[PDB]
C-alpha cells in the first residue's frame, strides 16, 4: 500500500522538539515524488542520497522524526551544528544519510495571545549524542548547593516554552520539521519506491 507519510506530515498535532516523536515506516510503497513535488516546503535538504532516485531504491526501514522549532533554529537540524537545539534537543550524526524537511506552521501552531505548549530544553549537564532524546524534568543545578524540591540558588527547571504568536518575526515563528533516516540492513527490504525491481 502507500506509505502513511500523510499521517506524519499532515499530522494534526506535533511534538515538542525536546520530546521529538519518531515513526518507523515499514512494509509499503513510498512515493517520494509526492513530497518533493509539494513545493510548499521551505527547507528540503538531502544528504548522501539522490533527489529522485530514492523513488527507485528499497530500504529495510524508514524513520521519520518530527517536531516543532523556531525558524532561525532550522539551520541547526544538519550534521555537525551546535546550538541550543542540536546540543540539548535533537542531534544529527556527522555521517547522516537522509533528508531534512521543514515548513512554516505559523497559521497552525501560533495563536493570538501566545502558544506555550511547544517546549524545548534550555539546560543540560552535557551534549546529546546522535539520535538521542531526553525528556527528564530533573531540576537543573547551576549553583553549588543541591536542590531537591523545586528551586533554590540557581536551580532552574530545564525546559522552557517557545512563545508562538502570529505576529512574531519570521525567524521567531514556528516551523514543523520531519527528518527521514534510511536504514538498509541485511534483511528483507520492506519500504520500496514504485520504480524498483520488485514490482
Amino acid at each position, epitope marked *: 500500500n502507500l506509505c502513511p507519510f500523510g499521517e506524519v506530515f499532515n499530522a494534526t498535532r506535533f511534538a515538542s522538539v525536546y520530546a521529538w*516523536n*519518531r*515513526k*518507523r515506516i515499514s512494509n509499503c510503497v513510498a512515493d517520494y515524488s509526492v513530497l518533493y513535488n509539494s513545493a510548499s516546503f521551505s527547507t528540503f535538504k538531502c544528504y548522501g542520497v539522490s533527489p529522485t532516485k530514492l523513488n527507485d531504491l528499497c530500504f529495510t*526501514n524508514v*524513520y521519520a522524526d518530527s517536531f516543532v522549532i523556531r525558524g532561525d533554529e532550522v539551520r541547526q537540524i544538519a550534521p555537525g551544528q551546535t546550538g541550543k537545539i542540536a546540543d540539548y534537543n535533537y542531534k544529527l*550524526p*556527522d*555521517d547522516f544519510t537522509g533528508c531534512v524537511i521543514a515548513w512554516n506552521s505559523n497559521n497552525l501552531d501560533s495563536k493570538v495571545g501566545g502558544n506555550y505548549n511547544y517546549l524545548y530544553r534550555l539546560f543540560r549537564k552535557s551534549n546529546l*549524542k*546522535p*539520535f*538521542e*532524546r531526553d525528556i527528564s524534568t530533573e531540576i537543573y543545578q547551576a549553583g553549588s548547593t543541591p536542590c531537591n524540591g523545586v528551586e533554590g540558588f540557581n536551580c532552574y527547571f530545564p525546559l522552557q516554552s517557545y512563545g508562538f504568536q502570529p505576529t512574531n518575526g519570521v525567524g521567531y515563528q514556528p516551523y514543523r520539521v520531519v527528518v527521514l533516516s534510511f536504514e538498509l*540492513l*541485511h*534483511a528483507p527490504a520492506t519500504v520500496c519506491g514504485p520504480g524498483s525491481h520488485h514490482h
Partner: antibody, heavy 128, light 108 residues
Framework: EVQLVESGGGVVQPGRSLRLSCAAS????????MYWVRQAPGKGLEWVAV????????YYADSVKGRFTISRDNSKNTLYLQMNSLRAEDTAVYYC?????????????????????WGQGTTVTVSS | YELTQPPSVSVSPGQTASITCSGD??????ACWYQQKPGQSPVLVIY???KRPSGIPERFSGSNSGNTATLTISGTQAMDEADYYC???????????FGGGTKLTVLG
C-alpha cells in the same frame, strides 16, 4: 526480584540445531530491549544478538548471521535463541541480558544503554 | 569496528587503577563497563560514559573523550580483582561491540 533464567543448553552434535530460552520475571519484560551474549571457555564476551522491546527490529553479529534467530514472546515473558547449523566454535556459555532503558510504548523510539541485568548462563558444548 | 583494551593491569590495594578502551570516534558513542569475577555473570559498573548504576560503589568512575574511554577505581580493594570489559553500542545499525577485556589483579 528482577530475574533472568537461561535454559536449554547441553551437549549437541555439530551441524545440528538447538533452541535456548530465557525466562524473565520481576519487571515489565515487554518494555525492554533484550540481548544474547556468549563467552567461550577462557575467552571474552562476544555479542550474539539483540532484539527490540516488541520484537520489531533484530540485529545479529556477523559470526552468527543467517544461522541464528532471536525472538521473544512478550505474553509469556520469554526470549528465545534458535541456533542452527551449529559449528564447534559456537561452544560457549550463553547469557541473556536486559537493556536498562525501557520504552513507554508511544512512538517507536529506542536508545540502547548498558545491559544491567544478566542471567546466570546456559552452557552449549558442540562436539562430535 | 573494534574496541581495544589493555590485556592486564595490576595494582596494590588502595591504589588507583585505570583501564582504557580505544575505538574510532568512541567519544561519539556511549561506553559501558562490566565487571566479571570467575564463574560469575557480568555486572554493570558504568554506563553512559560516567554514570554508575544503582548499588555500585562510588569508587568506580568513568570517562570518555576523543577516542578513549577510561574506567577508574580509586582505593582499589581485594574484592575488585576481576576481568573488566568495555562495551559500545553504535548509534548506527544498533551494533554492539565489546572490548577484549582486562585482567585487573590486586596484589594482596
Amino acid at each position: 526480584e528482577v530475574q533472568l533464567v537461561e535454559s536449554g543448553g547441553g551437549v549437541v552434535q555439530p551441524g545440528r540445531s538447538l533452541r535456548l530460552s530465557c525466562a524473565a520475571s520481576g519487571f515489565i519484560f515487554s518494555s525492554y530491549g533484550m540481548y544474547w551474549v556468549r563467552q567461550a571457555p577462557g575467552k571474552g564476551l562476544e555479542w550474539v544478538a539483540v532484539i527490540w522491546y516488541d520484537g520489531s527490529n533484530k540485529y545479529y553479529a556477523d559470526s552468527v548471521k543467517g544461522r541464528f534467530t532471536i525472538s521473544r514472546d512478550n505474553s509469556k515473558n520469554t526470549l528465545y535463541l534458535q541456533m542452527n547449523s551449529l559449528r564447534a566454535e559456537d561452544t560457549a556459555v550463553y547469557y541473556c541480558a536486559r537493556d536498562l532503558s525501557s520504552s513507554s510504548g508511544w512512538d517507536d523510539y529506542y536508545y540502547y544503554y548498558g545491559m544491567d541485568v544478566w542471567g546466570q548462563g546456559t552452557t552449549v558444548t558442540v562436539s562430535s | 569496528y573494534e574496541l581495544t583494551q589493555p590485556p592486564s593491569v595490576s595494582v596494590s590495594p588502595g591504589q588507583t587503577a585505570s583501564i582504557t578502551c580505544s575505538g574510532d570516534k568512541l567519544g561519539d558513542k556511549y561506553a559501558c563497563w562490566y565487571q566479571q569475577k570467575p564463574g560469575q555473570s557480568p555486572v554493570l559498573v558504568i554506563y553512559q560514559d560516567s554514570k554508575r548504576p544503582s548499588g555500585i560503589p562510588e569508587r568506580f568512575s568513568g570517562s570518555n573523550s576523543g577516542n578513549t574511554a577510561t574506567l577508574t577505581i580509586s582505593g582499589t580493594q581485594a574484592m575488585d580483582e576481576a576481568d573488566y570489559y568495555c562495551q559500545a553500542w553504535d548509534s548506527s545499525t544498533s551494533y554492539v561491540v565489546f572490548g577484549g577485556g582486562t585482567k585487573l589483579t590486586v596484589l594482596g
